[PDB]
Structures are given as C-alpha cells and as structure tokens.
Write a protein that binds this DNA or RNA. Structure first.
Lengths: 68, 66
DNA sequence: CATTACGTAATG
DNA sequence: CATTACGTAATG
C-alpha cells in the first residue's frame, strides 16, 4: 500500500500542497502585520490633524472672549 | 534509538511543548487581528472628529466674507 | 487540490 | 523547555 506507486505520487502532491498552503498562511499573517503599520501611520496622521484643527479652533475661541 | 524509556519520555514532553507553542502562536495572531480592529475603530473615530472640526472651521471662514 | 491536527527531529 | 522545517493522514 505504502510501496504502491499511487501512494508515493499521492504523498508527493500533498507535500507540495502543504508547503504552498503554509506559505500562503505566512503571507496572510505578514499582510495583517502590514495592516497594523498602515493603520498606525494613518492614525498618527489623523490625531495630528485633529490637533491642528483643535489648536486653530481653540486659538480663535480664546481671542473672541478677549474683547468685551 | 527508540523503544527506550529515554526516548518515549522525550517525545511526550516535546509533543506537549509543540501544542503549547502552536496555541500561543494562534493567540498572537488573534491579538494582531484584534489590533487591526481597534486601529480601524479608532481610525473612524478620528476621521469623524477631523470632519467635525473641519466643518466647524469651514462654516466660520464662509460666514466671515459677509 | 487546500486545510489542519498531530507528530518527529533538529535546534536555540 | 520553545521554535520550526518537514511529513502524514484525514477531511473539505
């Protein structure tokens, strides 16, 4: 059964499919890791934008009250 | 090599460690995908603030050219 | 073919 | 002990 040629071919093909499936799983993990870095960078960009608008706004609010 | 008590025990212990190591890997992967969902949720939060501030600013500039 | 539990062995 | 390449077998 294990010395039959059909078992040997069967194992050859599955071994190839296993390697391929494990390597695609790696890549999906790397992509998810890449996503964390993209969200983090865009997150940093967005809070700095919020901080700019917050400043521009708060600056104005304080000078408006600055004149009865 | 095998059939020895030495080898049977060594395998029992490695098998336990493998299972542990694979379960811990599952969880770090789980954690990483938890992180994308929080960065995504926090992203949407920050976008909506930028938009609210942008609106508040923009209405101001427009009303000033009267 | 693709996926995954389970195991072996080499290795840090 | 923990990690990982490599393989087997059951299964979708």
């Amino acid at each position: 059964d294990k010395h039959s040629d059909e078992y040997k071919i069967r194992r050859e093909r599955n071994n190839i499919a296993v390697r391929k499936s494990r390597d695609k799983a790696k890549m999906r993990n790397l992509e998810t890791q890449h996503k964390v870095l993209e969200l983090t960078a865009e997150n940093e960009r967005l809070q700095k934008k919020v901080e700019q608008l917050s400043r521009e706004l708060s600056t104005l609010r304080n000078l408006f009250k600055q004149l009865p």
